[PDB]
Amino acid sequence: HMCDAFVGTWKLVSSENFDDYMKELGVGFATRKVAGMAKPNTIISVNGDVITLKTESTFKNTEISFILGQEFDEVTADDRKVKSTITLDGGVLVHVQKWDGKSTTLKRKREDDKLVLELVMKGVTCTRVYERA
Ligand SMILES: CCCCCCCCCCCCCC(=O)O
């Protein structure tokens, strides 16, 4: 039940400020050029308490599986080794990543028929809108 609203196959339809977000992350220029053009699919599924989130794109795929509230180690699309915790607060799936004394947040919520992803690092806010494939 908990994450039913998120389950599905979602395709990126719009993005704002992703370059600036990737810059704050430390992603290099070649990767930023590729990744700025990517239109990934995100596939969210659930098996009991275990949530899986796949991100697929031409250049790079990632997958994480997790239990809400339980820290896990993640290797990000840009090769960071982070400590991740994901919680569900008021319909918002909140993913925090911590590494090397830094933090970023990845927050997903439903907005009408869309899935909206907010990516925050320092002063940068990026907004990614996904629609059902
Ligand atoms: C899509 C290629 C991304 C490659 C490098 C940037 C990685 C940044 C962290 C990933 C942020 C998630 C973006 C998303 O799911 O839309």
From Swiss-Prot:
The modification Phosphoserine is found at S14. Pfam families: Lipocalin. GO terms for biological process: brown fat cell differentiation; cellular response to lithium ion; cellular response to tumor necrosis factor; cholesterol homeostasis; fatty acid transport; long-chain fatty acid transport; negative regulation of DNA-templated transcription; positive regulation of cold-induced thermogenesis. The modification Phosphotyrosine is found at Y21. Keywords: Acetylation, Cytoplasm, Lipid-binding, Nucleus, Phosphoprotein, Transport. The keyword Phosphoprotein applies. One of its GO terms (molecular function) is long-chain fatty acid transmembrane transporter activity. Its main location: cytoplasm. CDD domains: FABP4. A fatty acid binds at R128, V129, Y130. It is found in: Cytoplasm; Nucleus. The modification N-acetylcysteine is found at C3. GO terms for cellular component: cytoplasm; cytosol; extracellular exosome; lipid droplet; nucleus. A motif (Nuclear localization signal) lies at residues 23-33. Lipid transport protein in adipocytes. Binds both long chain fatty acids and retinoic acid. Delivers long-chain fatty acids and retinoic acid to their cognate receptors in the nucleus. Monomer. Homodimer. Interacts with PPARG. Forms a beta-barrel structure that accommodates hydrophobic ligands in its interior. Belongs to the calycin superfamily. Fatty-acid binding protein (FABP) family. This is Fatty acid-binding protein, adipocyte.
